Design a protein around this ligand. Structure first.
Ligand SMILES: NC(=[NH2+])NCCC[C@H](N)C(=O)O
Length: 226
């Protein structure tokens, strides 16, 4: 059986990788990448937006064929799913109010209220420093609602991947927030397939490799980051 539709699991509160434009259309780097992969495979994408923490189980239970969701390749997740070669290297950032001087790194979150996306690597990084240090960790499926808790004063900081932190700041120029503690790598993004689906995996890796040789990938990158 030759699958003509690729069901792509993603979460769409993660600009610039996946979000909704003013007409409600899914847009972003990951969206364009998924379409460019499908073109190489000779198939059509169907997006399946869902809450992030449910994506791995959706792949395991056959609700989707692939994940393209800014998903960091980790050893824990490699137990659950198989990943492509990395397609992006991200870092992390903390977003705080402009008048904040106490928070410059993860270590400084002691005693503070911190918002994170449920199921994310940021959640894990925060949980690691939060051991003992009295951090109050709050969780959101919709990251535009962790961010709104920061703008409203309901949390002191939020933590996410660095390009996404910048995109939220740029969307909120009057909202008096800033990035601190930025790092630039350490979160390699991978496309996930169901564990054991070696035929699909190989096709996706070959598509990535070709996209990086023929200009296709670089044009996507420049569109979103140039
Ligand atoms: N579309 C999304 N919301 N992606 C969140 C990804 C966050 C982080 N890179 C992770 O893998 O946990």
């Amino acid at each position: 059986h030759m699958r003509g539709t690729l069901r792509v699991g993603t979460e769409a509160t993660f600009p610039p990788f996946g979000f909704k434009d003013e007409n409600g259309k899914l847009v972003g780097f990951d969206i364009d990448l998924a379409k460019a992969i499908a073109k190489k495979l000779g198939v059509k994408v169907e997006f399946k937006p869902m809450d992030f923490d449910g994506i791995i189980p959706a792949l395991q239970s056959g609700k989707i064929d692939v994940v393209i969701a800014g998903m960091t390749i980790t050893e824990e997740r490699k137990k659950q799913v198989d990943f492509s070669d990395p397609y992006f290297e991200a870092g992390q950032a903390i977003v705080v109010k402009k008048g904040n001087d106490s928070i410059k790194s993860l270590e400084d979150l002691k005693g503070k209220k911190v918002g994170v996306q449920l199921g994310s690597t940021s959640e894990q990084h925060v949980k690691k420093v939060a051991k003992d240090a009295g951090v109050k960790v709050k969780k959101f499926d919709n990251f535009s609602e962790a961010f709104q808790e920061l703008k409203s004063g309901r949390v002191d900081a939020v933590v996410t991947d660095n390009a996404v932190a910048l995109a939220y700041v740029k969307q909120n120029p009057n909202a008096g927030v800033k990035i601190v503690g930025e790092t630039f790598s350490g979160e390699p993004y991978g496309i996930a397939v169901r564990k054991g689906n070696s035929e699909l995996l190989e096709k996706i890796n070959k598509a990535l490799e070709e996209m990086k040789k023929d200009g296709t990938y670089d044009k996507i990158y420049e569109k979103w980051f140039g």
